[PDB]
Each structure stands twice: as C-alpha cells, then as structure tokens.
Amino acid sequence: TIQPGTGYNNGYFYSYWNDGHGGVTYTNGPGGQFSVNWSNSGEFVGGKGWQPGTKNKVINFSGSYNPNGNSYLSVYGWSRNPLIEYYIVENFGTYNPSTGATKLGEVTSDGSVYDIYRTQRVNQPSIIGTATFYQYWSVRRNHRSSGSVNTANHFNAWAQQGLTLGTMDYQIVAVQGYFSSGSASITVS
Numbered sequence: 001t002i003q004p005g006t007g008y009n010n011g012y013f014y015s016y017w018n019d020g021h022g023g024v025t026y027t028n029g030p031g032g033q034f035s036v037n038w039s040n041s042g043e044f045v046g047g048k049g050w051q052p053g054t055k056n057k058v059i060n061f062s063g064s065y066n067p068n069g070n071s072y073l074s075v076y077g078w079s080r081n082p083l084i085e086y087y088i089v090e091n092f093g094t095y096n097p098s099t100g101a102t103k104l105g106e107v108t109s110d111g112s113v114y115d116i117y118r119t120q121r122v123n124q125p126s127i128i129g130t131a132t133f134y135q136y137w138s139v140r141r142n143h144r145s146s147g148s149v150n151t152a153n154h155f156n157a158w159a160q161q162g163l164t165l166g167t168m169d170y171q172i173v174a175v176q177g178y179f180s181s182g183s184a185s186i187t188v189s
C-alpha cells in the first residue's frame with residue numbers, strides 16, 4: 001500500500017490522491033496493475049498510466065470493478081494551458097457524472113456510443129493548486145471493466161464541439177470514489 005503521491009512503478013506512472021478522510025487503500029502491483037479497496041471513504045482518485053499522456057494513445061485496460069456507491073472507472077487526465085480535467089468514463093456506480101450536465105454531442109468508439117458533456121469545478125484542487133476549471137466527459141453507454149480506448153476519437157470529438165485541450169499532463173486509467181465503498185483490480189497497457 002502506498003502514500004498518496006505520484007511516481008513510477010514497474011514502468012508505469014501512477015497518481016494516487018485523496019482528501020485525507022480515510023477508508024481507502026491503493027496498491028501498485030506488477031506491470032500495469034493496481035488495486036483499490038475502499039470502505040466509507042472520502043474523495044479519492046488513483047491509477048496507472050503515463051506522464052505525459054498523448055492525444056492519440058490507445059489505452060488498454062482489464063480487470064474487475066466493484067463499486068458500492070459513488071465511483072467511476074475512467075481514462076482520466078489533465079491538460080495545462082488551458083487547465084482541463086478530463087474523463088472517458090467506462091463504468092460507474094450509483095451516480096452518472098453527467099447528471100444535470102448539458103449534452104454537447106455523441107461519439108462512437110470502441111464498441112459503444114458515448115455522450116459528451118462539459119462541467120465546471122469552482123475553487124477545487126487541481127494539479128496546479130486551487131482553481132476554477134472545466135471538465136470534459138465522454139460517458140460510455142455500454143458499461144464495462146475491460147476494453148480498449150482510442151483516446152483520439154474522444155479528443156477529436158471534444159475539439160469539434162469546442163472543448164479544446166492544452167498541453168497534456170498525466171493520463172491514467174483511474175478509479176475515483178466520493179464517500180463510497182468498493183474494490184477494484186485493474187491492469188493497464
């Protein structure tokens with residue numbers, strides 16, 4: 001089990017962040033593998049991938065994802081200049097993160113239609129400190145916990161709709177939770 005922070009493990013970048021609440025354990029395993037076990041957590045996000053990401057990576061993921069409450073399983077990352085937190089959401093628990101958000105299009109990729117949304121975070125943590133910034137979402141209609149994500153299809157559809165990305169920072173397959181419980185074991189490549 002590891003400290004919240006970032007680094008490399010078995011050739012993969014990882015990021016593990018939480019709000020200090022307790023109730024979440026994050027572990028790095030062999031190769032591109034990581035696990036998360038959580039029970040009455042606060043907020044957290046963790047997983048493995050790349051630093052920096054790219055705008056045409058094909059990301060493969062495999063494993064098991066068993067949320068009990070509010071959680072997402074996503075390709076997750078940031079850009080800088082502009083600061084953007086983005087998600088290609090492959091599965092989630094009790095809450096669809098696009099609830100209440102305005103739909104800005106659709107994209108078909110990797111066996112499913114996805115719906116596209118923009119939201120905004122106001123004075124929230126980020127890779128550069130507390131900030132107000134937009135979030136971009138592609139939400140998969142057909143939920144799954146293994147597959148392949150052609151990120152270019154998403155980034156190109158976002159750009160088409162006016163959701164432009166700056167310079168890529170990290171890019172991971174992440175489990176996120178918000179005051180929930182669950183378990184997950186995911187392998188990235």
Ligand SMILES: O[C@@H]1[C@@H](O)[C@H](O[C@@H]2CO[C@@H](O[C@@H]3CO[C@@H](O)[C@H](O)[C@H]3O)[C@H](O)[C@H]2O)OC[C@H]1O
Pocket residue numbers: 015017043044045085121124125126127128129176
């Ligand atoms: O020490 C600093 C780190 O703590 C910081 O980490 C980032 C903090 O913001 C995190 O993003 C939140 C995660 O939850 C969302 O979905 C929210 O909308 C965000 O506010 C991000 O995951 C962490 O990487 O990075 C900079 C360090 O100085």
